[PDB]
């Protein structure tokens, strides 16, 4: 599951995993797994 929240803060990356600042608001990982 690709993770995304901030815009134009990581550029165009194939993988969802992007660098995060002091505080990033993103969808928390699913309970599943």
Contact (CB, 8 A) for 6 and 21: yes
User: 1-33 as b/e, with b when 16 or more CB fall inside 10 Å?
Assistant: eeeeeeeeeeeeeeeeebeeeeeeeeeeeeeee
Up-side HSE of residue 11: CA atoms within 13 Å toward CB? Answer: 1
Closest to 4 in 3D by CA, of 21, 12, 16, 13: 16
The method of structure determination was: NMR
Distance CA 30, CA 33 (A): 8
- The two counts, helices (H) then strands (E), for the chain are 0, 0
Token pair 């699913």: residue = 30
Q: What angle do CA 12, 24, 7 make, to 5 degrees?
A: 30
Distance CA 31, CA 20 (A): 22
Distance CA 1, CA 22 (A): 22
| DSSP tag of 6 | S
């Amino acid at each position: 599951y690709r993770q995304s929240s901030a815009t134009s803060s990581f550029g165009g990356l194939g993988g969802g995993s992007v660098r995060f600042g002091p505080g990033v608001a993103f969808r928390a990982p699913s309970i599943h797994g």
